[PDB]
Design an enzyme around this catalytic site. Structure first.
Site, short mmCIF file in Angstrom:
data_model
loop_
_atom_site.label_atom_id
_atom_site.label_comp_id
_atom_site.label_asym_id
_atom_site.label_seq_id
_atom_site.Cartn_x
_atom_site.Cartn_y
_atom_site.Cartn_z
N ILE A 15 0.81 -1.20 0.00
CA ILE A 15 0.00 0.00 0.00
C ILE A 15 0.85 1.26 0.00
CG2 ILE A 15 -2.06 -1.06 0.99
CD1 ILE A 15 -1.13 -0.46 3.69
N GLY A 16 2.17 1.12 -0.11
CA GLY A 16 3.07 2.26 -0.14
C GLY A 16 4.22 2.08 -1.11
N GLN A 17 4.36 3.02 -2.05
CA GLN A 17 5.39 2.96 -3.07
C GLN A 17 6.09 4.31 -3.17
OE1 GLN A 17 1.99 3.09 -4.68
NE2 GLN A 17 1.60 1.33 -3.34
N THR A 50 7.87 7.56 -2.56
CA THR A 50 8.22 8.54 -1.54
C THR A 50 7.74 8.10 -0.16
OG1 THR A 50 6.27 9.97 -1.47
CG2 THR A 50 7.71 10.13 -3.40
N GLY A 85 7.61 5.64 1.59
CA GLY A 85 8.23 4.40 2.02
C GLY A 85 7.69 3.15 1.38
N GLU A 86 7.81 2.01 2.07
CA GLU A 86 7.20 0.75 1.65
C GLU A 86 6.27 0.28 2.76
OE1 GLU A 86 10.11 -2.35 1.14
OE2 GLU A 86 10.70 -2.22 3.25
N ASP A 94 -3.15 -0.29 12.98
CA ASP A 94 -4.45 -0.83 12.59
C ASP A 94 -4.78 -0.40 11.17
OD1 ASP A 94 -5.20 -2.37 14.75
OD2 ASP A 94 -6.15 -0.71 15.83
N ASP A 118 1.54 18.09 8.38
CA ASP A 118 1.43 17.41 7.10
C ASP A 118 -0.04 17.15 6.78
OD1 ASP A 118 2.38 16.36 4.74
OD2 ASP A 118 2.82 14.38 5.56
C1 LIG Z 1 2.93 6.44 8.59
N1 LIG Z 1 1.91 5.44 8.32
C2 LIG Z 1 2.39 4.21 7.70
C3 LIG Z 1 0.62 5.63 8.67
O1 LIG Z 1 0.34 6.58 9.41
C4 LIG Z 1 -0.48 4.75 8.27
C5 LIG Z 1 -1.26 3.94 9.10
C6 LIG Z 1 -2.19 3.26 8.28
C7 LIG Z 1 -3.22 2.34 8.48
N2 LIG Z 1 -3.93 1.89 7.45
C8 LIG Z 1 -3.63 2.35 6.21
N3 LIG Z 1 -4.40 1.85 5.20
C9 LIG Z 1 -4.58 2.35 3.84
C10 LIG Z 1 -3.32 2.31 3.00
C11 LIG Z 1 -3.64 2.69 1.55
C12 LIG Z 1 -4.32 4.04 1.48
N4 LIG Z 1 -4.69 4.35 0.06
C13 LIG Z 1 -5.55 4.11 2.37
C14 LIG Z 1 -5.20 3.73 3.80
N5 LIG Z 1 -2.67 3.24 5.91
C15 LIG Z 1 -1.96 3.68 6.96
N6 LIG Z 1 -0.92 4.57 6.96
C16 LIG Z 1 -0.37 5.25 5.78
C17 LIG Z 1 0.12 4.28 4.69
C18 LIG Z 1 -0.58 4.71 3.40
C19 LIG Z 1 -0.86 6.17 3.63
C20 LIG Z 1 -1.39 6.13 5.04
#
Ligand SMILES: CN(C)C(=O)c1cc2cnc(N[C@H]3CC[C@H](N)CC3)nc2n1C1CCCC1
EC number: 2.7.11.22
Lengths: 308, 252
Positions: free
Chosen positions: A20-22, A24, A26-27, A91, A136
């Protein structure tokens, strides 16, 4: 070398599912707990050019996410190790705000839009009262669970604030950046996130950001073309800024806040709250407490739970 | 749990160091040595007392999981101080911590070449040790210190500058000489620090108008049976430390 580690379980306890992350951001992986099936999200702490051991920013993010436990803020389950590398366990919230807005199949009623902005303002109120700046605020950082619960995420660029401060000016994306940061203010506070909250509220009806600047000058020009020119009568004592004499910007603009956003926003109270959210002066910008008491969240239609 | 990093008198007896042969008294000497190394390096690296105290609390919790035999105090402390400095807003550079930690442990030896093979290993060893400290602590890095509760309590007893400084002195040395930070909460330790400081300076806070003692207003779980018990343990090991009581003794 095979060290005793009771309070740091291995990330192999979860089973990765899809990325779900590519690039910038991260991964990031969608993962599943191998016993309970609890859907989670894993982010590897990147160790690029860290000649100083564990990243100080990863320390700051972990410390912040451990203090912030709220219904409208993402939840840090734990921090896992590998068979050294470090993962963040969140979560899983399935939906994000930007993904739903840029999808024509998704439609928001006025009642549901009231619920989204109430959960975002409640989340901003909680993190501000906990002495935490988000720094942000953007649509892609706002997620909504499959239950309809809005969660504030991506606290990497987040820092704590106290009450002449010297903070970091290169924060917040250009399209959501407040005028204080563009003018070079290093003593800023909570209202910098509330400015981005207004850019999100208007984005609910426009399905696209409202001030898509390309450079820092183009963004400051875009702000003045919508919220009026930067005037010391509108921004009392905007004079002390270094870049105030070097701005090179428009000077005869008048607030197009309610006029330009009039077509997409039908509600009178919604336009009135957006006007007070996108205020040029930080000391006169509406805060998280007053905006939740604004008559937008207390007139028909009332906020309703999320389903579409 | 809130009971994770707090232990009983039987728990501390069965410490991981006890399971490898370290005596109960030999382990307290190892903790006291590490805190002195943490304070020595911290005084040289010009970090606040808060940073050192955080690294000491890391060290006290680190050896509740690990043993002094597998991890020496001379190795964990420079890595624990490097971590606490970054967390407490006073980050010290990696090559600077090893610089100070060298002359602290080896005043006669010369620091190896920065491009040598041995120097690059201890740079890796500190980062490896910092990572193990983070993993040992479960990335729980926020520490509550009694100094936050001492100032809040000496203000409401109208103690002078002298008595408030002595209560602050009892707090810094409770982290150096006792495992109070591993059994009693910061509000309870702060009550123990102010009680012994009052017994030392012949200062006696009278009972308030409600028939309530001063320690009831800070923590309800604090009793006089506990205060005298802990101020006695703290005072004994303070009497064992050279030149420590001289710093708060009245020569007039
Ligand atoms: C610093 N990180 C890693 C976080 O705060 C975090 C906690 C998350 C919990 N669930 C999700 N889920 C989905 C990822 C795909 C997206 N299109 C909808 C949300 N993303 C989380 N993220 C980030 C990764 C993706 C951008 C939001």
């Amino acid at each position: 070398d095979s060290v005793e580690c009771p309070f740091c379980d291995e990330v192999s306890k979860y089973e990765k599912l899809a990325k779900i992350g590519q690039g910038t951001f991260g991964e990031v992986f969608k993962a599943r707990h191998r016993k309970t099936g609890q859907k989670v999200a894993l982010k590897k702490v990147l160790m690029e050019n860290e000649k100083e051991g564990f990243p100080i920013t990863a320390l700051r993010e972990i410390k912040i996410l451990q203090l912030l436990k709220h219904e409208n803020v993402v939840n840090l389950i734990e921090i896992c190790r590998t068979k050294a590398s470090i993962y963040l366990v969140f979560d899983f919230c399935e939906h994000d705000l930007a993904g739903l807005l840029s999808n024509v199949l998704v439609k928001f009623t006025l009642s549901e839009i009231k619920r989204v902005m109430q959960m975002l303002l409640n989340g901003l109120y909680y993190i501000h009262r906990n002495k935490i700046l988000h720094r942000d605020m953007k649509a892609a950082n706002v997620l909504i669970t499959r239950d309809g619960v809005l969660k504030l995420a991506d606290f990497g660029l987040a820092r704590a604030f106290s009450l002449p401060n010297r903070y970091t000016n290169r924060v917040v994306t250009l399209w959501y950046r407040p005028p204080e940061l563009l003018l070079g203010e290093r003593d800023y506070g909570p209202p910098i996130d509330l400015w981005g909250a207004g850019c999100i509220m208007a984005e609910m009806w426009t399905r696209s950001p409202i001030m898509q600047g390309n450079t820092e000058q183009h963004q400051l020009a875009l702000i003045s073309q919508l919220c009026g020119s930067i005037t010391p009568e509108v921004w009392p004592n905007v004079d002390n800024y270094e870049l105030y004499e070097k701005l090179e910007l428009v000077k005869g603009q008048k607030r197009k806040v309610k006029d330009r956003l009039k077509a997409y926003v039908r509600d009178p109270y919604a336009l009135d709250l957006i006007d007070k959210l996108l205020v040029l002066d930080p000391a006169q910008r509406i805060d998280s407490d007053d905006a939740l008491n604004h008559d937008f969240f207390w007139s028909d239609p009332m906020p309703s739970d999320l389903k579409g | 749990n809130n009971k994770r990093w707090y232990f009983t008198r039987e728990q501390l007896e069965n410490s991981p160091s006890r399971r490898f042969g370290v005596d109960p008294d030999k382990e307290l000497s190892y903790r006291q040595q590490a805190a002195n190394l943490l304070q020595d390096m911290g005084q040289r690296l010009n970090v606040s007392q808060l940073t050192i105290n955080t690294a000491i609390v890391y060290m006290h919790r680190f050896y509740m999981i690990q043993s002094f035999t597998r991890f020496p105090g001379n190795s964990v402390a420079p890595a624990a101080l490097f971590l606490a400095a970054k967390v407490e807003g006073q980050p010290k550079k990696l090559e600077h911590v090893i610089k100070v930690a060298h002359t602290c442990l080896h005043p006669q030896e010369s620091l190896p070449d920065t491009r040598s093979e041995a120097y690059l290993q201890q740079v890796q060893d500190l980062v490896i040790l910092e990572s193990i400290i983070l993993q040992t602590l479960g990335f729980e890095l926020t520490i509550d210190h009694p100094h936050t509760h001492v100032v809040k309590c000496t203000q409401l007893v109208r103690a002078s500058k002298d008595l408030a400084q002595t209560s602050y002195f009892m707090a810094t040395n409770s982290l150096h000489l006792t495992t109070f930070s591993l059994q009693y909460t910061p509000p309870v330790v702060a009550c123990v620090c102010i009680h012994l400081a009052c017994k030392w300076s012949n200062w006696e806070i009278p009972v308030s108008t409600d028939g309530k003692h001063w320690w009831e207003y800070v923590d309800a779980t604090v009793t006089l049976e506990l205060l005298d018990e802990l101020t006695h343990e703290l005072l004994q090991i303070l009497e064992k430390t050279p030149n420590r009581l001289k710093r708060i003794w009245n020569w007039r």
